[PDB]
Amino acid sequence: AVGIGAVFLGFLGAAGSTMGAASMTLTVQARNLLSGIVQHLLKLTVWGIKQLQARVLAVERYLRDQQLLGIWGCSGKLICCTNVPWNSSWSNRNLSEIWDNMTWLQWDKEISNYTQIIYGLLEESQNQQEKNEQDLLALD
């Protein structure tokens, strides 16, 4: 049929859409993780400490997530690919069953049991088996 171009769903505005379609609008949720903006006779500072604590905690959480992506291979983020083999013990389903018929919520409700082992494999594999390889490639 006819078309005019893409639209703007909004922040968190594709959580019910399909797996492929929600991977097109990853960019509008990365902005609002840090969000920004925000913007008597000086008796007490009771919400001059707590708002500031919330902002410091948000900055530290974003820095922790960026540091977690920095230890693993890339930091050219929002999508990249690595070299861990996907074992069939973690939710053995077909590609069309999880990439056409799923939201991301139903994906996390299945892979909520195996975040730590996947994180450890991504912690070790590309970060100690892609490194110490280029130094032998650059002999000449």
């Epitope: 049929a1 006819v2 078309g3 005019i4 171009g5 893409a6 639209v7 703007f8 769903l9 909004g10 505005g13």
Partner: nanobody, 119 residues
Framework: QEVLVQSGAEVKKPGASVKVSCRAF????????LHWVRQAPGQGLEWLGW????????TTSQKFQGRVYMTRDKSINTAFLDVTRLTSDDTGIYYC???????????????WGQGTSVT
């Protein structure tokens, strides 16, 4: 909950211009394209054109090219239809319609306004 609210009825002299408005309630306005469809009284549906509320890209049919304009405003979630150089054939009821817009193409018109009568 997904409704479109329209302006009141207008009566105009020939050769003038008419401006109608269409405001969205109950859905994210920047996510679905918007059509303008007219009905002369006692006859069928006639198409004018369609607008993206995000990018501002417009499309008018070639019979009404240079005569019918479509603008938008995201602050109040409203689209404006301007019809210039009026004759007596433009008298009728006008609808703004929401497209379902699945897979970056036109699919079907599911939400319609109450209509604006122009004479």
């Amino acid at each position: 909950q997904e409704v479109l609210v329209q302006s009141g009825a207008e009566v105009k002299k020939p050769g003038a211009s008419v401006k109608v408005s269409c405001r969205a309630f109950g859905y994210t306005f920047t996510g679905n394209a918007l059509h303008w469809v007219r009905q002369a009284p006692g006859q069928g549906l006639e198409w004018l054109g369609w607008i993206n509320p995000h990018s501002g890209d417009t499309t008018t049919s070639q019979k009404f090219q240079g005569r019918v304009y479509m603008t938008r405003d995201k602050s109040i979630n409203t689209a404006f239809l301007d019809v210039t150089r009026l004759t007596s054939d433009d008298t009728g009821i006008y609808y703004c319609a929401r497209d379902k817009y699945y897979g970056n193409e036109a699919v079907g018109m599911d939400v319609w306004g109450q209509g604006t009568s122009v004479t």
